[PDB]
Design a protein around this ligand. Structure first.
Ligand SMILES: O=C(NCCc1cocn1)N1CCc2ccccc21
Ligand SMILES: [Zn+2]
Length: 140
């Protein structure tokens, strides 16, 4: 589990969104596994605006933050899980890093701020959903 809290937005994995998220929906995209809902309180996270390929992510199944090298956001075939059929997921970045289902939502960050959240993984893979192209998270 986990979310990004930037401005009056909450960014979560679409497959983990709650009824309150769907009832206060700003934007969602199944191909990216992302959903954004509105919040009453302002958040403290800042979004990175960059092309970094190194950063650190939080792994809840190890209670640890790990430094990783990750690929640029791309369209990658991901295997069936409880939440999506084997399909192509867009804006996804891969790294070698330990992963399990309850980790979705952990933040990946670089020197500039939050880069994305954990979404896919398996066999020493972990795939993040990028948010650096969503410039509107910084305003309104
Ligand atoms: O179950 C999921 N993610 C579900 C969301 C998803 C995105 O694309 C398809 N399903 N993951 C995330 C971490 C992990 C480690 C080992 C095995 C699976 C998984
Ligand atoms: Zn960066």
């Amino acid at each position: 589990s986990g979310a990004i809290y930037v401005g009056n937005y909450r960014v979560v994995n679409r497959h983990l969104a709650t009824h309150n998220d769907w009832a206060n929906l700003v934007w969602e995209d199944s191909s990216r596994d992302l959903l954004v809902s509105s919040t009453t309180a302002q958040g403290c996270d800042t979004i990175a605006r960059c092309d970094c390929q190194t950063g650190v992510y939080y792994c809840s199944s190890r209670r640890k933050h790990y430094p990783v090298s990750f690929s640029k956001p791309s369209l990658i075939f991901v295997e069936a899980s409880e939440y999506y059929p084997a399909r192509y997921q867009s804006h996804l970045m891969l790294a070698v890093g330990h992963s399990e289902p309850g980790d979705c939502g952990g933040i990946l960050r670089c020197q500039h701020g939050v880069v994305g959240i954990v979404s896919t993984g398996g066999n020493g893979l972990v795939g993040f959903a990028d948010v650096r192209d969503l410039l509107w998270l910084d305003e309104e």
